[model samples]
Target: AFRIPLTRFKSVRKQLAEEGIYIHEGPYPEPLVNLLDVVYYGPISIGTPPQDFQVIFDTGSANLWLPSSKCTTKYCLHHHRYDSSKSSTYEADGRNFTIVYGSGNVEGFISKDVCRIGSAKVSGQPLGEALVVGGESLLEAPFDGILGLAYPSIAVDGVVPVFDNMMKQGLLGEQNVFSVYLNRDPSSKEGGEVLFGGIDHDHYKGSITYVPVTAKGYWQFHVDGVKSVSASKSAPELLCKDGCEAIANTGTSLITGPPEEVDSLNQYLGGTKTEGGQYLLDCDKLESLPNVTFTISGKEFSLRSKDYVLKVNQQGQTLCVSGFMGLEMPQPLWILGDVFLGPYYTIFDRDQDRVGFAEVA
Candidate 1:
């Protein structure tokens, strides 16, 4: 249950293939667009002499992975690949690890290496170095691997996530707290920062509002209300009538909802579904519309029209897609991706099984 669009995978894959970047990891049961948001990075050093690999801090899935030198694919050659033979800390554990995504598959084996994140360092930690990456986006991704924030339960058997080890060893400042500040401002030098074991007062406005984590499997919480915020209160259309459960995923980009709800909401916003399985709307009319607001535990989190419209262009004429997509899932699962996380500073607490949010300062 990574908060991504299984419904939009094929469409995005086609778009990627148009640019000559497509992969067949394997045949999926159906077409999907799992995720493509390369939003945050965890800068860490691996191996004995510690080779640095900036991995994406993905709360979506568990297991830390990086491309190995053995992969001879085009994307592998373009980016930095890790070599086990060159490092004294590398251990060929031989336990094969494979993660199959909606679009492709990533295959690797267990490796014992010294993992370091900023000042916190741990030795003999199991890191995954990819031997073959069939995932198209990962091959071209700027970051090397992924650092999963999910629980040890979701991780592949025998794999201990980096953060869990950090916590177990008492490397963090707060026992079960980690804060994320993702800066949307392009001019800001500090684009994003993940405060381990603590929160940064300078980044957020006031006190933090802590919410219970409904699903320990993922950072999921209950959204009591969702409405259209006027530019009128325009009668405040109900986005989620029975309330919705949203997963706060850092690796995901789009804010997705179930097909039934998403269709109604987008249709109300004057967006028409494309044949390729996406929504197209009037970019010019974005200003006329109000923000899409979600209320959880009495607090309001909103996505203005400006933030909800994506500008995708190569030739350029303002080809826009809604940041929100319809998921093919049965349950009322909403994916609160980077799009939602962008506006608020979020904290995931391991000890209490809760989450926190604050307005950016």
Candidate 2:
């Protein structure tokens, strides 16, 4: 019959604070940024007294990394660096870390501190404090660091990932799940939502389809087939005729597959190859371009013309950049990135060990 804000009363608050069970609030979501439809990142804090940094909640790799304060490189100077001495809760690990990316390699030392996403806090999180951030793509990127959501097996030196630590520490609720909603509108100031511990019902339409995680490292899964939705009955499959392994990665920007497979798909869509191995398509033909669909677990997930093409204005002319690219890796794989995830809302379920997808609302 009565309402009260208990924390407002200092006498009762101090007694309760000493008793444990401090206060838990959730479905707390971290708001993200959509930088020209290229990257999606959000704010996360590290250290005591909270040194803030913007990080990409990447699912492709596993590690939490930021540039070190001691970094003297030109690239590191452009971004915010983590200083262990500045953090009161900091514990030195001093173990050297080297993460190799396709672009370049980043070398650093590990340090432990309090890492907070929204109100949930994870203590003693070993994060890479980069002494050298050696990527040209990283220099122009907007985010300060990357927080990987993949399994800990891929993490450098077997350091437990932040999300796993959160789960172990009972920071998240009973359900160990996090969902992502990437806003595709470049004009919008609100990028998207990274809701931890729960899914936002407003962000998606219809029911979510869950698929088993094929690999423990990345959020890998199996696809039955990937083909162009063409009117002609005789048209062949675009890629993954039998089946293929694919990963849903927020870190990557394109819908990448094998080189030969991507070349055939792009050429079928009337794309011309550039010297840099990118495809250029006619901007006017966007309307006529066919939909590319991926058949997963007997469900057909499709991407429309506008969804798979990036329009860029270069030298005062608008150019259409094909969203599909060719990348040869250790195995035949497809990377579903912003191009695919923009159209489908994705959920990473740690407890269930599966990934869910639904149409974006």
Candidate 3:
């Protein structure tokens, strides 16, 4: 089976060790670079000669984009740019491409070329070559581009997603499933792995709990409810008491929900807001903190305190922050990001139109 081995930049790995968090390990799978355990990326190549770049394998959107040689913006100069002249298989598309992200906007033109991910070679793949890279975050990002894994329905130009092309090309063998495994063990050099067209048995335990995709665009699904264990009797009802729409987005770092609900939930956890908008709680109280459980597809998936709280060393002091965050967005929607994905191996089964989660080993 074809797979991509992912790893973090050595300096970042060393940086994490000093901060007390390590990384993960695996084989054949594309190695992912874990940046402060917040953002992750892996190596991918576009064109015949294979110009490599670090890309975020984001499941929230569906488009493969890279900075092109035509871009002269200051932001584009920092990262590697895609050059069509150097690739023998390059074909000009020239169609304008633009996408608006949570952080910023990226505008570019479409280019067709041979793209390679891990061992799978996708011939004649349509991709975006950025002419303008907006947003300070995108300018300083360690990764060169973003490879979206969501469905083509939301893809900016009606271009098929890479995974869909892979399936159509018979690159995934018989099963049309791709799985994600994120490693947070700071001691390990391996950051995580994205197994295209297959799942790594060693990375997870037991059987996977599968749920049908409720919405077509973003792996949206219905969550039965969310609650905390060992909370006070008078605590506000956990979010999604009856039901709520949620999505699993690999691009996001923390779990996000409606502002009011998230604030109540964090307060219930004894968390106080910091000036930076992060929820800070007593590090010593983590052990006694309650577990947050989410009910999905009639099964309960729980995250322990150690899993939802992040410890950071600031000025020689270790500070603990709640992983749950709040932002005003589309109402009644929850985004289950890496904070929720780290402990579980998630699989996007396109063939069956379902998503599966299994406890990571």
Q: In order, what lDDT does every prediction score?
A: 0.70, 0.76, 0.78
User: Which residues of candidate 3, in runs, are more than 4 Å off?
Assistant: 8-38, 137-140, 231-237
> Which should have the higher lDDT, number 2 or number 3?
3
Name the regions of candidate 1 deviating beyond 4 angstroms. Answer: 1-35, 137-139, 229-236
lDDT of 1 by residue, 1-361 (tens): 0111101111344356345453332223322224344556657778767787777777777788877888787756866778889889777776888876664677788777778777777677787777766654554455666778877767776689877898788777555677877765556556677778777788799778888888676777898877774544345568777777888887766687877677777877778886545677876777776688888888887778777776555244556777777776545578787778878889888989888888877
Which pairs, if any, clash in model 2?
Answer: none
- Expressed as tens digits, the lDDT of each residue in 163-278 for candidate 3 is 88998899988889989988766778778888887888999998999988998888888899988857445654567787888888887667877778888889989999875566
| Displacement of the residue 356 alpha carbon in candidate 2, Å | 0.3
Q: Could you tell me the TM-score of candidate 1?
A: 0.86
Candidate 3 structure, TM-score to reference: 0.89
Q: Deviation in angstroms for 126 in model 2? A: 0.7
How well is each residue in 1-361 modelled by candidate 2, as lDDT tens digits?
A: 1110000011121122233222211111211112222366778889988998877778887899998899988877878888888999999888898876543567888889999887778899989998876543345555677788898988999368988998898877787888888777766656777788888788899999999999899899999899996775467556788899899887656788877899999989889986545688988778878889998888999999889997654556667878898777666678888789889999899998999999999
Pick the TM-score winner. 3
Rank ordering of all candidates by lDDT, starting from the highest:
3, 2, 1
